[PDB]
Design a protein around this ligand. Structure first.
Ligand SMILES: CC(C)CN(C[C@@H](O)[C@H](Cc1ccccc1)NC(=O)O[C@H]1CO[C@H]2OCC[C@H]21)S(=O)(=O)c1ccc(N)cc1
Ligand SMILES: [Cl-]
Ligand SMILES: [Cl-]
Ligand SMILES: [Cl-]
Ligand code: NA
Lengths: 103, 99
């Protein structure tokens, strides 16, 4: 419905992100504490982490202080990389771009 | 009205005569609640998240109260680690995501 993708949540709230100079599709996800992206190379050091969701847990690599643009908004923060079914923008970066849930 | 996302967006819901805590989740297509009984008919469904699929019972035309707002829709019931209010019902309480 109302445009990015979409504001009233009748369609998935999908946006384009840019990370490591590549464009990807991601979901704005208020139910995600953390941002999680499919396998890709990121600079710097990382640390393993397991995170859980509906189905159980997956091991991810945690990269801190990564520059990522989200729907045109610049953010710099933690990105988890692993076998997620969807690229997810979680609250750690939603707060950086000033996203709010209103109702 | 406006929920910041510095913490998890948790609300109280009333469903099937009980009160529960649930997460307002724009990343969820569907509402999924921990095991409970609901009246009427249901059919089995599989739903996938991070870390694979779980089997749930799909109940249609269930009335819920979310933070005070009544709504009706499908509710999936099964071994989810968190009660999640998905877009199918967020739309019914006029939730929007703004930035
Ligand atoms: C992965 C998404 C595309 C979909 N998920 C909703 C999502 O909001 C879950 C919702 C969620 C929340 C807690 C536990 C399980 C699932 N969040 C999630 O997995 O976040 C993980 C990354 O950050 C961490 O903080 C939250 C858990 C971790 S889902 O729970 O798997 C899901 C799938 C299908 C339906 N119909 C409803 C929900
Ligand atoms: Cl976008
Ligand atoms: Cl962060
Ligand atoms: Cl529905
Ligand atoms: Na029913």
């Amino acid at each position: 419905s109302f445009n990015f993708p979409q504001i009233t949540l009748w369609k998935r709230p999908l946006v384009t992100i840019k990370i490591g100079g590549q464009l990807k599709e991601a979901l704005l996800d208020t139910g995600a504490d953390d941002t999680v992206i499919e396998e890709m190379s990121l600079p710097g050091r990382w640390k393993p982490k397991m995170i859980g969701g509906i189905g159980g847990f997956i091991k991810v690599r945690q990269y801190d202080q990564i520059i990522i643009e989200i729907a045109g908004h610049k953010a710099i923060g933690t990105v988890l990389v692993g076998p997620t079914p969807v690229n997810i923008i979680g609250r750690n970066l939603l707060t950086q771009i000033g996203a709010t849930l209103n109702f």
